[PDB]
Amino acid sequence: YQNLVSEAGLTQKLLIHGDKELFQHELKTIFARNWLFLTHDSLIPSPGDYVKAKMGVDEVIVSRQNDGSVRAFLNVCRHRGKTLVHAEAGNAKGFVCGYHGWGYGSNGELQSVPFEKELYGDAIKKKCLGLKEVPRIESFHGFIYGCFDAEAPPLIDYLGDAAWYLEPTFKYSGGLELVGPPGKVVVKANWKSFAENFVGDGYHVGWTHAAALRAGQSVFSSIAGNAKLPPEGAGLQMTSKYGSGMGVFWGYYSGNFSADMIPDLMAFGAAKQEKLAKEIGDVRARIYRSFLNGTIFPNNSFLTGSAAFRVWNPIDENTTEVWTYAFVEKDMPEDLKRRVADAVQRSIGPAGFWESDDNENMETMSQNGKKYQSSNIDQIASLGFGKDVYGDECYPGVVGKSAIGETSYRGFYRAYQAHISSSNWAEFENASRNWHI
Amino acid sequence: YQNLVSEAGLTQKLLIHGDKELFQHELKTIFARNWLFLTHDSLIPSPGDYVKAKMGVDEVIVSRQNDGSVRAFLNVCRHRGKTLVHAEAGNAKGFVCGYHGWGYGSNGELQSVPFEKELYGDAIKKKCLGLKEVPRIESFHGFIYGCFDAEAPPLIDYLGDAAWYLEPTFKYSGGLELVGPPGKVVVKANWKSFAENFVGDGYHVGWTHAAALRAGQSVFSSIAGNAKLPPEGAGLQMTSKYGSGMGVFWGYYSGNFSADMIPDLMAFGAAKQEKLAKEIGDVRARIYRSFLNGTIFPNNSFLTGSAAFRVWNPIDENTTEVWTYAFVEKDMPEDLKRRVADAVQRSIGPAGFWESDDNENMETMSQNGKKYQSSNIDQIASLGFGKDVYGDECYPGVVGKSAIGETSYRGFYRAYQAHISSSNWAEFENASRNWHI
Amino acid sequence: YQNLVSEAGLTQKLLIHGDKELFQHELKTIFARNWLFLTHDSLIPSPGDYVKAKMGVDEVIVSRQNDGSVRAFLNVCRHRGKTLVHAEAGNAKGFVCGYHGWGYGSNGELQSVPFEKELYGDAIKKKCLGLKEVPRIESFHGFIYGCFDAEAPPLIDYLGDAAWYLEPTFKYSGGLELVGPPGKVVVKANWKSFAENFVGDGYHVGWTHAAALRAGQSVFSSIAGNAKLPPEGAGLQMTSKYGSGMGVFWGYYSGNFSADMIPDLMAFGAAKQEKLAKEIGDVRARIYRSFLNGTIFPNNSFLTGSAAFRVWNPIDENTTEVWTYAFVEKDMPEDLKRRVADAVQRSIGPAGFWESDDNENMETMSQNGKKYQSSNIDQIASLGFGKDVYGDECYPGVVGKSAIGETSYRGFYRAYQAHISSSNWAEFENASRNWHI
Amino acid sequence: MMINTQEDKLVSAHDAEEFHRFFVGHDSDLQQEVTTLLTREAHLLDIQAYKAWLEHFVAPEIKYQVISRELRSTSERRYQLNDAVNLYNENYQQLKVRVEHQMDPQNWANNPKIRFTRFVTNVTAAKDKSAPEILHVRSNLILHRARRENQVDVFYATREDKWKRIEGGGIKLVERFVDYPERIPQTHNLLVFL
Amino acid sequence: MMINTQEDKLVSAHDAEEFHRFFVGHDSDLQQEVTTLLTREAHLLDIQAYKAWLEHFVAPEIKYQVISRELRSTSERRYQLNDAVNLYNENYQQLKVRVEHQMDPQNWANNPKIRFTRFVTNVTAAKDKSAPEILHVRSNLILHRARRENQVDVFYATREDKWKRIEGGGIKLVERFVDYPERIPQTHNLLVFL
Amino acid sequence: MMINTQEDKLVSAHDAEEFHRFFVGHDSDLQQEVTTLLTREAHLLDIQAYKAWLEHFVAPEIKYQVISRELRSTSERRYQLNDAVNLYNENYQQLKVRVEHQMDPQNWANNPKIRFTRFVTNVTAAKDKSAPEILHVRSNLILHRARRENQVDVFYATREDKWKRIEGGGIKLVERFVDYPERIPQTHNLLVFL
Ligand code: FES
Ligand code: FES
Ligand code: FES
Ligand SMILES: [Fe+3]
Ligand SMILES: [Fe+3]
Ligand SMILES: [Fe+3]
Ligand code: NI
Numbered sequence A, B, C: 001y002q003n004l005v006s007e008a009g010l011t012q013k014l015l016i017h018g019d020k021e022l023f024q025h026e027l028k029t030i031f032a033r034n035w036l037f038l039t040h041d042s043l044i045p046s047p048g049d050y051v052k053a054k055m056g057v058d059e060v061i062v063s064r065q066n067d068g069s070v071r072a073f074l075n076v077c078r079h080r081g082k083t084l085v086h087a088e089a090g091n092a093k094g095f096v097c098g099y100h101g102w103g104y105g106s107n108g109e110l111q112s113v114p115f116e117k118e119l120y121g122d123a124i125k126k127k128c129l130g131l132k133e134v135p136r137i138e139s140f141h142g143f144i145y146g147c148f149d150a151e152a153p154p155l156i157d158y159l160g161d162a163a164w165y166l167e168p169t170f171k172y173s174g175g176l177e178l179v180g181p182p183g184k185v186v187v188k189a190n191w192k193s194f195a196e197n198f199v200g201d202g203y204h205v206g207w208t209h210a211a212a213l214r215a216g217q218s219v220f221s222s223i224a225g226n227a228k229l230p231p232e233g234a235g236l237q238m239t240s241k242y243g244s245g246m247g248v249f250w251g252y253y254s255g256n257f258s259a260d261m262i263p264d265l266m267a268f269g270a271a272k273q274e275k276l277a278k279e280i281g282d283v284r285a286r287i288y289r290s291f292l293n294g295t296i297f298p299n300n301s302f303l304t305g306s307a308a309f310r311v312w313n314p315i316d317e318n319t320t321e322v323w324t325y326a327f328v329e330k331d332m333p334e335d336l337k338r339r340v341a342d343a344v345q346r347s348i349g350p351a352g353f354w355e356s357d358d359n360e361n362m363e364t365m366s367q368n369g370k371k372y373q374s375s376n377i378d379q380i381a382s383l384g385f386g387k388d389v390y391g392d393e394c395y396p397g398v399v400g401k402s403a404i405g406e407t408s409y410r411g412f413y414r415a416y417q418a419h420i421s422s423s424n425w426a427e428f429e430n431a432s433r434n435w436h437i
Numbered sequence D, E, F: 001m002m003i004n005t006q007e008d009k010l011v012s013a014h015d016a017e018e019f020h021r022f023f024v025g026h027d028s029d030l031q032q033e034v035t036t037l038l039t040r041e042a043h044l045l046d047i048q049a050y051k052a053w054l055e056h057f058v059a060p061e062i063k064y065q066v067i068s069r070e071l072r073s074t075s076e077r078r079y080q081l082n083d084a085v086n087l088y089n090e091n092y093q094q095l096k097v098r099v100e101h102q103m104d105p106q107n108w109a110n111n112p113k114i115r116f117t118r119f120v121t122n123v124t125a126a127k128d129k130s131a132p133e134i135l136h137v138r139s140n141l142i143l144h145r146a147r148r149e150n151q152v153d154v155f156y157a158t159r160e161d162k163w164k165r166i167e168g169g170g171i172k173l174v175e176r177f178v179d180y181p182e183r184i185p186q187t188h189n190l191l192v193f194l
């Protein structure tokens, strides 16, 4: 697995998007090790609320505890291994297994065992039979992540330089809410194909989405046909030590939404921008009302403005279960929140007309990685190469001067290669000592 | 494959129900080595009668010979390897291959070869081109088993201590008939999931089948909700050297049948019990009219009373072709036989309402064994552990005092682990020298 | 992979038609190395015309160049690896990638890159990013083949002794045209099952197709039931160094066509035969109007007379995408050409009634190769063994005196075994030094 | 319109006769009436109103039968063991038991609520020639069942029914017979009301 | 014909009421008329005449809504967060945008031309009891979509419609609602007009 | 009701005209008659009464044609090689040959007996404007074929037919055309009468 990504993340073997054995290896070195998105506070707001989530191929119950904390457990009974919960979300003080009737608390503890007194006696120790717990649960402004590896860096350190870019929308805007339920659909593409598209693909917008731009008159109509750069400038792209990265298209708060959404959204963002400039400064207040497209390593992607939150849940090397949520700013009028929620699905949900265009790209790439001759072709991530900077006075991380660029592809794949060639976090750290140089 | 089952069969890695490579290994160490159920005399009663059966993933033609014996052959032409027979059952004195017309006898001998004289001459030796025969064919009171391994113990020795428990129904009741054709359906679960459920799962009945018990008013309504043990007592469970085992629920001759079957079946069983007590004694005559649930290692399961005979035919690590027959006592009135046959399918056939409940358990267990994190969770088979006996004056084998127990799970998995860690029968024997201690 | 085919190609392990790992190995040693059929001149007759074709599991664009030559390229963009072309055939001077808009010429050169000046500058070298080209493209009388291995023998040398048999129809008849589009259908059989059936299976015709012979009254009705050899004689079968081979049924110009096609086709062939005898001699003029069934190694098969051209495109070890074209002699009346084209599909296309019979054989053979016990059964290719000759004064190659024979099976499988046990062409040559002895 | 079973070698005597029954029994008014009946029945089943179905659409004397036929050679004759297993062969009480199991809050398989969609086509009907209150009905069904996020099972069947007119205007099922076309269903089970 | 939702434990109040609506609303003439309407609509969509569909079959006030319902426990009550996401929830302008995207020569996904086949069954209709110009219509749909040589997706749905009679004789769709039965479609997307 | 093919960019001239044909040709009596005809035809085929079908439902002058269309770019023009292969293109004698092959006791593929179920929907009809004895008929078909325990193939098609009224009251097929929607069927073959 040593030479799948070249130096500086410049090239990737197409095989990575189709190889079966590599997928198995990723379940060990990517999904067993990294922070994975679970849910938002707003989806489990009250004690006993739970959602099912996937962490890689595994399923977990994510439960609001009586003390207000959140714990998550593999969705598997400790007796004979039956799946415990079949609802996608709900409220419950405990979970009873339908096979033999073992009853667990929302804290994962084994509480009740039918025939315990009559048949088990001292042959059972319930304290040893609690649900298998996810050992690390942390949040970033309400967004809750889990990790199977107790040695992982804290979530905030894992976000690294990416956190600074997220803060105007995620931290300083007065609170976000994730609007459920998510759209869910299965797509015949590798999880990495979506992850790379969202981490940094500004280049595709004007070409892949030419028809969508004409029909809906999105603000992105400026780059239609890849003929001209945005009048606002080429934007930015950044990447970070642990692989997260994103592009910034200045001012594009309505993102991939159609013309009917633009006036009201732009007015809302412009008004808050004016307030925010006094608190966090002009540049960051502008970031607040710009379009950010990114990936929180490995498989959680987002758009700001046309506010979307996505999980590329791996099923196998050629199959992904795609989850799509909208998010809203807490202080938006309720009617605007509802319009945003519908508009996200309209563009990129299971019946999203932009999503149709994107999927057209994702599936064939992944299919070609499965084919013997074609799998040896390199993908190239050369756009902006040789011009990225580190230690800029204004913009942290490794930064390029264009959202149409592959700065964040290179950072994503560097981190990916470091993980697949490492057995643990300490080895990843050694492999990443010179990540910015 | 060494540490998949712990000492005394106490725990099993959940992975065993989902691992692809292990399934391949089982085709070598389980299905190539052990006795596998083929058919009953009553389904091939006359010369030339045949049935197709599966032995693991392979298909065999099981044929009643002119001299009254039974022989079985792989369903594969010796010329270019085309499948020879496509009917599930029939009567024929020979089998002709539809590709080039080679004709075999029901004894597997190559008899006719088109263009033999004109084109083959001495370039063919028909004696060397007979169908590939199953080398071991034996029966237990009409139930015919095959084995690919010529070194296998005799079938009666393989049944071991389990035979004693089967005899009241199978031997002493005046003859059984298997009622065909079987129900057949594909279920997305590992073959072992069904095998363990049938070998010893009395514990699930009152919980998994709570709704079915309420609706049909089966005699098993006594243990509904796993609230109380049967008034007749906890029953028995046993296991044996070569892995076969079963539970006994005293008196429950109508088993999983609904109230409309109970009076007539109970009257029939009670009447024969009175006669049998004089021949085989009180305890064994009671066993005759009790409910036994068991597995004849590896993948043949049965219920007595609500009389069912099942084969869990493996397709892959996550897929099983489930066959369900009824059996009847030969001296039952013909109308009762017909009612029993329908009642078996009504409970546990492809449209069986109890089967729906059981399958709900089988599929997810097996699915969880495929998932990276979840596959490392242990199944535990601790119920009754530390209280099993060997050498009891009345009940042979390794025996526990409850049909709600995991005595027979432990014996099944011990034998399983011994087989997967052995290359031949001699190695299995060495690994099983202290099976009861 | 060393002992899958026995000495002289006499036996083959049935496993070869079902083994997953072997299929992967074939993509390296068979499909990466050998000549594979692409298209005919008549399907890309004008500059800019292209067809998609498969070469093994890979897809290629086969394009008529402005200078009249033909070049072929993997159907994969050099940027992020998206499939470039989705139409099966067309005319175009270039191919634009729908993801980011990179534009290639029909010569494979990268010509246009959106934002090249603004964003790439010297970070891109277009000369290094042309489509991945198939390095070897050669034809045999209009039939165009490709090879991934630059070290391959010239196509004419690869056809070896088979070329002599093909020439009366392919070279001396005044030109053939391939009639598109092909029928396409997926069949659940290994590619080799079809290849062996077409390379030499005269034996199946009278048995497998008994019903079709009765219904349509094909000239092959002479061998119905495998009761009698053709009155014209047993025919011929040949094989060659690089694996190609075929049978000859004398005089049977209407092949598998029904009675309604026979008078007009026979009259056309008889008339040209009379002319051809003066140019190429009596024997070869008779071959021109005989039925040849063969395979051009590895996976291109043909029938003359009832003129068909087939590709067994591998999908996996148990799945093949079957392509079926008709071919016609250029100087046939246009109405006869249309009748031939329809008649080919009527017999062996996706709704072909003979094809239904053949597929019945192909699928089960391949299925049996997947099954543990059955996969160890040998296929035997013994028909005519010990009577083949080399260096005959009239008929070149290794030749047997019957089209109902397995001469060409033996040669096909010898070449197959030599390839799978070799790393390159030089090793194949060493393994084939005594191919005829 | 009759079928000559000597020339039509694949047609059973049973199927030939039924074809003739439905050919000569065509009546435009009856076709409309029975199409409405079967559409109502399918709607009721799709929304899982099993008690309303059993009470209002099913007669006390119901025989509800679905068989799986063992695959036998067309050309052999001799083997005369029963060739059909009853996947269903239910009287009214047996249907009641099944209905109560479907609706029980502790039927674990039915939580979350499963989704059914039924497509009824090719309806034909014929009044019985002896018992005019009896309507013979043939119809083809596609049944789509979705559950548990990504489980989808599609069933295909021909229902051969006898329905009976009731005093008051209702019509109730007295027999449904299905010869299920797949010998080994690959739909996990056949626990659906066809 | 009414459903007793206390005894029929699986039936929602909503579904029980709709069943009754369509039961009592049966009219033979209306059934024929609406069957023709839906067949014409499906034909127009199958040949991809999306502009003709939007102009002639869809009313200016259209609400075109397809939901995916989160799977919740039948037995819990407490969790009251919205259980439905709108895969479609379109007004006329939003449909216009989608139509223009479908037809644009630079919609890369639509080259080569995709193939649609629609099967409409189980049609029922009822005139609204207040607004007689409004027709409530229920129908089941199978939609087959084939593209790119070997891609086949089959969609299954129940369409709950309101149609409105227009001055001049036409009938136009004012609401279509679909509760899509598969929570996670395995059809690559749901970018089809149900 | 007409389609403007300049605005409706995805619609072929051919499809636009056919849509109009079936729109204006609507007749309630004809709809009922043709629905019965197609239901009878499908029943006969499902029970494998191929000789009765060929004799009684198919005219001597039959053209029975099923094409597979090569996938071409919507935007290119120049490439003019024939884009369709005839999977079927049969006259009466050619159908007779196929029928006799289906029924032959030595058709090895047909033992054990295969199971067919046909679902016909979306029937429309129009009398020809010149030849009133000719009925243009469109209908959609789902065909389910089950064999060999676990083989299931489902076919989806639109049949574009011309039927002819016969002296005596019968109606026989003079042309059936199917543009098969899957370019590469994944049903093992297409050896079914659509
Ligand atoms: S598997 Fe959960 S209680 Fe037994
Ligand atoms: S494969 Fe059986 S006779 Fe040839
Ligand atoms: S993948 Fe082709 S232009 Fe980017
Ligand atoms: Fe996009
Ligand atoms: Fe059970
Ligand atoms: Fe053949
Ligand atoms: Ni019948």
Ligand code: NI
Binding pocket: D052, D055, D056, E002, E003, E004
């Ligand atoms: Ni009621």
Ligand code: NI
Binding pocket: E014, E018, E160
């Ligand atoms: Ni509703």
Ligand code: NI
Binding pocket: E052, E055, E056, F002, F003, F004
């Ligand atoms: Ni118009």
Ligand code: NI
Binding pocket: F014, F018, F160
């Ligand atoms: Ni047409």
Ligand code: NI
Binding pocket: D002, D003, D004, F052, F055, F056
């Ligand atoms: Ni007749």
